Design a protein around this ligand. Structure first.
Ligand code: DKO
Ligand code: DKL
Lengths: 309, 310
């Protein structure tokens, strides 16, 4: 069974394109997929199918500035003012689109990259429906977000021209670390996957619209959600629910396994149960890399079957 | 990769809602999925994903009066005047939406039910891309379309109100035989599949729109496409390309396997390469029955891989 859900974004501009996929038979759980930067929810076709085969409802949308939402509105790589609050609020609104249909079922959030930061940010808001947390391509302690990004220069650019293309220097500062283990044969987006096939497909997918320039205010939104996701309030208010992490050891987003380990570690220090899957020699999109995809999907299915409150 | 490929129907009314799904890597074939009556192309999620894994581009549209195309036009279970020629044109147009992109790949057409009839009607037209034909839920020699449906009473209804819902008598007549092997427990849609879970999901899916009544002219369209699919000109003009058939023994659409067997034997009689998968104890949607899904899928992958060797 398929449902199309549209709603007005918290930004008042975008018609957020959303889908709910229901399996045949009586479902046991709801899985909300939150996609990352420069991609869309319908890229998760293999994983959506696998979660339906396992008897889960799947709900996902294309965020403000992305995929079919961008393709209908005409605005890529901008989510309007307060970018961070908009995509958080939008992911909460998506949950309420199933109110009364599945209130008895456990609800697992799966976030990738930017989706991981949104998920972590949602986990700390009262009234977020969340019985289990699954993060993929965790953004934790890469040099760019930690150190290189000059927040004064971003603040000044946010005061002069918040709707303009983000200055090139702030983009390159933000993603500093992402080319550290790539040769020239890899390319500028080689950190996306060891697999050149997945990287080329990432580039061609018209619903990724790769290259599309972020707005200043969008970049401030990346900095804001990065700070919410990795701040003391996250660690201290993360509810005691099952947590699973999926990362590639070569993924720069989690500082090549080190940043991901520190997330797990701090969560464990504060009494949380964290299941860490680290795929040795794989890059960012371990859910799409052909040597890891099956393990990410089979681990997430086992996770959901137990993380069923 | 995902392409959204909508185009204006031959009926001049509807915006045909279409998608192309491209796999990771160099694809080795294109598979066109053609869905049947009261269903939609995004119901093939499992098959689409299985074909992408196998390294094939998949293309499909929601036909006139169906799925997202009905949802955006507002018109359900009607495909315009000359319904058959509309849906046949729209599937040839669907192919042309990829022109320039995969011109040296082999093209398999997979049709289920109404889609199986459309696929056979396509096979007779020149300039149809078709290197292999795969048919599921085959509509061949069931009592309703063969003898029960009164073509005089249909001509009356077509002369009085082609746009109004088909009179109850013609709809009951067309599907006469579909209840012959259902207990009271199976219920009216029981023929869809042995699995109650599939039948219940079929009824619930909003993009299937369970109880939408056919127009008289849509019904004229089913009778017309049934005769193109099963008439002498189909058997006489079918190209010399691999053919695969998938049917349930308990599927009434193919006279409980008798009609599907008759399709195989008659194509063979003219020297055609035919591969026959009849699934004992299963009903219409053998591509959705839990017990046969995987086998219909891996047999389609094997078939396509075989077509590609040329
Ligand atoms: C296509 C290039 C922009 C992608 C940034 C990476 C995605 C995760 O960081 O959200
Ligand atoms: C008439 C019920 C909907 C499914 C019909 C069968 C096939 O002819 O597509």
């Amino acid at each position: 069974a398929l449902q199309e859900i549209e709603f007005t974004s918290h930004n008042g501009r975008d018609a957020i394109q959303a889908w709910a996929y229901e399996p045949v038979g009586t479902p046991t759980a709801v899985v909300q997929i939150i996609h990352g930067l420069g991609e869309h929810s319908r890229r998760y076709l293999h994983m959506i199918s696998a979660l339906l085969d396992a008897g889960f409802v799947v709900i996902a949308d294309d965020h403000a500035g992305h995929g079919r939402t961008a393709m209908q509105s005409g605005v890529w790589a901008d989510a309007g003012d307060n970018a961070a609050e908009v995509v958080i609020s939008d992911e909460l609104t998506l949950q309420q689109q199933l109110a009364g249909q599945f209130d008895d079922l456990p609800w697992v959030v799966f976030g990738h990259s930017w989706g991981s930061m949104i998920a972590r940010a949602m986990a700390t808001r009262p009234g977020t429906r969340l019985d289990g947390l699954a993060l993929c391509g965790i953004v934790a302690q890469p040099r760019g977000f930690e150190t290189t990004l000059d927040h004064k220069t971003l603040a000044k650019a946010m005061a002069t021209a918040p709707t303009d293309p983000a200055p090139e220097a702030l983009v390159a500062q933000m993603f500093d670390g992402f080319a550290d283990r790539l040769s020239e044969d890899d390319g500028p987006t080689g950190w996306v996957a060891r697999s050149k096939e997945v990287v080329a497909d990432h580039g061609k997918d018209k619903f990724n619209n790769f290259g599309a320039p972020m707005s200043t205010r969008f970049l401030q939104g990346l900095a804001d959600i990065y700070a919410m996701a990795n701040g003391d309030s996250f660690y201290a208010t993360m509810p005691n629910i099952p947590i699973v992490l999926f990362a590639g050891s070569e993924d720069p987003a989690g500082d090549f396994g080190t940043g991901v380990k520190a997330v797990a570690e701090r969560l464990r220090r504060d009494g949380h149960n964290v299941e860490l899957h680290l795929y040795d020699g794989l890059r960012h999109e371990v859910h799409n890399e052909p040597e890891s995809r099956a393990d990410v999907e089979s681990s997430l299915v086992t996770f959901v079957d137990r993380v069923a409150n």
